[PDB]
């Protein structure tokens, strides 16, 4: 009100830097799997409990120490250096399973160039079984064993899951996705060739039309007939399945993937480009706009879901039976398919989604590129060419098994195990380290001499007792709740749980490995070794 201009300027600057594909795709299907309404309140609880203080702590550490995500431990706790390798492995797994969504989006963009939309056509085009063009526009009875045209398209064109009988049967590699991910990695490598993106012109123009396209999509979803059945399910208390059902772990994973803390993306961006420029408020407005964008995306998704439920004459939670990351390209497909300017809106949405995914990927790779250059500033920092291409080839070789015909079987597997418990335990370890093994009063004096004002009492009591105990309880709930993965007409076998546990272990075992390795190089008894590894180093 009184400062609306400064507020809207900061809102523009944060939406040009904070919004990513995560809060648009990972949140809706996760909230739908746990039930609408009964997930929003735990989402805000988890956020306000353990996502804002960690965000501010990571930002302050990056602004003060001015080092990479792995080089912070060289001046705080040299024993806890395995966190860097853990973050690197986590980001490697991400880029192994994160590029699939961008590849699917670019394939949709390429296939959305014809005059007739492929989502509104199932007349023996690629592969169609039990199709239904019009839901209720021609007085047709939607019986069982019926699939939507957009569902059949996603199932038979962008990835041919029918060739694979499950996770245990992986066929060949689809060339239509390989040639797409090749161009994706090529255009990604050309943007991180140098790594100088602070006030670019492309970002300021590409962070404008996403807002208006989201607004017009929300308007079209609101003015859609029979779309009021999804709003009630999205704002339902539903206290019966919130006592001991294990809902907080999904909200924790979502808030850790969307916000940024726990991935090394905040430290790489706080190491530079900002040094005492209105701190303690930038993180707040960033979290606010991120939560608002996530809420708008979830509302649009649930509105389209209620519209499809009213069209199919079924329950809102029964439209997508066991759909995982496939809920985006189905609801949004049926939403765009019911617009006057279908082709233009479709191509604009695909372009903004591709740009958002690219901007999100450029932020993730920056947390690993500039991080390892501090420990090796003479063999890899001066080159800037032999390491970027190397990590690109490494991420491409790791993202080749997900391009199989059964790609949806691998994406759903690398979704809840590669980033579920690993990010949580990394955040817990780093928080308890900076709290106890470094001194909360030391960090308070540091941020005081840096900014000029001490944080409130709510933040000081958090990092010492609230955040560590809560993260430990979240980890205990993760360990005490075996996951139950189930895709479209497929049940994951028993060895899938063991494979997921092994995947979620190699990205965490580096910290104990370095802990055991640190107690060998320094001689003497265990007492002096511990008192030397705990105390920081001096330049």
């Amino acid at each position: 009100r009184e400062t609306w201009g400064k507020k809207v300027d900061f809102l523009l600057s944060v939406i040009g830097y904070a919004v990513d594909l995560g809060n648009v795709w990972r949140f809706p299907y996760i909230c739908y799997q746990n039930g609408g309404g009964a997930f929003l309140l735990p989402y805000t609880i988890m956020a306000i409990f353990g996502g804002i203080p960690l965000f501010y702590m990571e930002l302050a550490l990056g602004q003060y120490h001015r080092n990479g995500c792995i080089s912070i431990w060289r001046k705080i706790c040299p024993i806890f250096k395995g966190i860097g390798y853990a973050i690197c492995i986590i980001a490697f797994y991400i880029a192994s399973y994160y590029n699939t969504i961008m590849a699917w989006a670019l394939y949709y963009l390429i296939s959305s160039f014809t005059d007739q939309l492929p989502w509104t056509s199932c007349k023996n085009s690629w592969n169609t079984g039990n199709c239904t063009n019009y839901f209720s526009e021609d007085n047709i009875t939607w019986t069982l064993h019926s699939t939507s045209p957009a569902e059949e398209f996603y199932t038979r064109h962008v990835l041919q899951i029918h060739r694979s009988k499950g996770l245990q049967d992986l066929g060949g590699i689809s060339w239509q996705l390989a040639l797409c991910i090749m161009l994706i990695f090529t255009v990604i490598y050309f943007s991180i060739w140098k790594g100088v993106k602070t006030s670019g012109k492309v970002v300021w123009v590409t962070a404008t039309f996403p807002y208006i396209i989201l607004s017009v999509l929300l308007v079209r979803g609101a003015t859609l007939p029979g779309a009021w059945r999804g709003v009630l399910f999205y704002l339902k208390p539903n206290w019966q399945k919130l006592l001991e059902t294990g809902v907080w772990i999904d909200a924790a994973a979502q808030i850790f993937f969307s916000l940024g803390p726990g991935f090394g993306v905040l430290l790489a961006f706080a190491s530079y480009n900002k040094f005492n420029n209105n701190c303690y408020q930038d993180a707040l407005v960033t979290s606010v706009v991120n939560c608002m964008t996530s809420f708008v995306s979830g509302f649009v998704i649930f509105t389209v879901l209620g519209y499809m439920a009213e069209m199919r004459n079924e329950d809102v939670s029964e439209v997508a039976k066991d759909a995982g990351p496939s809920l985006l390209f189905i609801t949004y497909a049926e939403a765009i398919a019911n617009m006057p300017a279908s082709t233009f809106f479709a191509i604009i949405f695909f372009l903004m989604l591709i740009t958002l995914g690219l901007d999100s990927t450029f932020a993730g790779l920056e947390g690993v590129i500039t991080a390892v250059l501090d420990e090796f500033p003479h063999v890899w920092a001066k080159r800037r060419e032999r390491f970027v291409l190397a990590v690109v080839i490494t991420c491409f070789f790791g993202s080749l098994v997900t391009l199989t015909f059964g790609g949806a079987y691998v994406v759903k597997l690398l979704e809840e195990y590669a980033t579920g418990p690993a990010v949580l335990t990394v955040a817990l370890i780093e928080a308890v380290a900076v709290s106890w093994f470094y001194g909360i009063t030391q960090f308070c004096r540091d941020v005081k001499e840096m900014l000029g004002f001490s944080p409130g009492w709510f933040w000081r009591i958090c990092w010492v007792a609230i955040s560590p105990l809560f993260l430990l309880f979240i980890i205990c709930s993760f360990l005490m709740s075996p996951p139950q993965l189930r895709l479209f007409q497929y049940n994951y076998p028993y060895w899938s749980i063991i494979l997921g546990y092994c995947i979620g272990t190699s990205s965490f075992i580096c910290i104990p490995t370095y802990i055991a390795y640190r107690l060998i190089i320094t001689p003497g008894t265990f007492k002096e070794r511990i008192i030397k590894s705990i105390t920081p180093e001096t330049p």
Partner: antibody, heavy 118, light 110 residues
Framework: QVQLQQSGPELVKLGASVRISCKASGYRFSYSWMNWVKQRPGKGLEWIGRIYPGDGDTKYSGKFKGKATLTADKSSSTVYMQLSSLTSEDSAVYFC??????????????WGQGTSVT | DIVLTQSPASLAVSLGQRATISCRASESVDNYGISFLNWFQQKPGQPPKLLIYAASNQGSGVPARFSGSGSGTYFSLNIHPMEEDDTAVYFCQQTKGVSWTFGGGTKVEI
């Protein structure tokens, strides 16, 4: 059972046009294609063009693009094939085959008696 | 346009003997795991009926005497139990894109 009826024998005229109907009933009408093959006397089969009920698309074999058109009708569940510039060698048997239910894409053994123009 | 030619031209009707009919699809390739190719049966004075679809499965109301093999480019037909009631002309038809055509015709007569 799916009975696919057709028209009767007609007469060929130099420069005139005919209209062969194809009334299909038994399954969902506006969900499968309606092919139109051409069987020359003594020779082999020959494709002309397909049509999907619902004004979606209308394909041809490249040669019959300007000599024949396909018009759908979702009311009476009939399919017409209006020819153009009928010549002497254009006297053959025109069947009406119905496509499959999607993925497979084959003739479901629903063929007519054949309206051999003469 | 995807052309389709048949290498055989005429076979001999032999009771209890093998009679193969092959139609090449060099200008084609499997699209989505299923072979876009069918098999018909045109009896003298009878409309062409369905014999074998997708080159692997058996059509509705078709006896087990016919069986199609091959995938990709080459395709063949197994008519090992051929009786005197199988004197017709078999055609091929591919459904890859807008290229729907027919073969030349492979009749049987001894």
């Amino acid at each position: 059972q799916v009975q696919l009826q057709q028209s009767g024998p007609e007469l060929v005229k130099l420069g005139a046009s005919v209209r062969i109907s194809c009334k299909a009933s038994g399954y969902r009408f506006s969900y499968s294609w309606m092919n139109w093959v051409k069987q020359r006397p003594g020779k082999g089969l020959e494709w002309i063009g397909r049509i999907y009920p619902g004004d979606g698309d209308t394909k041809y074999s490249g040669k019959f693009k300007g000599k024949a058109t396909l018009t759908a009708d979702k009311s009476s569940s009939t399919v017409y094939m209006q020819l153009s510039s009928l010549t002497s060698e254009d006297s053959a048997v025109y069947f009406c085959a119905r496509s499959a239910y999607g993925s497979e894409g084959f003739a479901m053994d629903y063929w007519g008696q054949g309206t051999s123009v003469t | 346009d995807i052309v389709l030619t048949q290498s055989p031209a005429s076979l001999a009707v032999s009771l209890g003997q093998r009679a193969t009919i092959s139609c090449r699809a060099s200008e084609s390739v499997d699209n989505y795991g299923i072979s876009f190719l069918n098999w018909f049966q045109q009896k003298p004075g009878q409309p062409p009926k369905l014999l074998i679809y997708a080159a692997s499965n058996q059509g509705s109301g078709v006896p087990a005497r016919f069986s199609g093999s091959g995938s990709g480019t080459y395709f063949s037909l197994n008519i090992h139990p051929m009786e005197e009631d199988d004197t017709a002309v078999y055609f091929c038809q591919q459904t890859k894109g807008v290229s729907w055509t027919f073969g030349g015709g492979t009749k049987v007569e001894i």
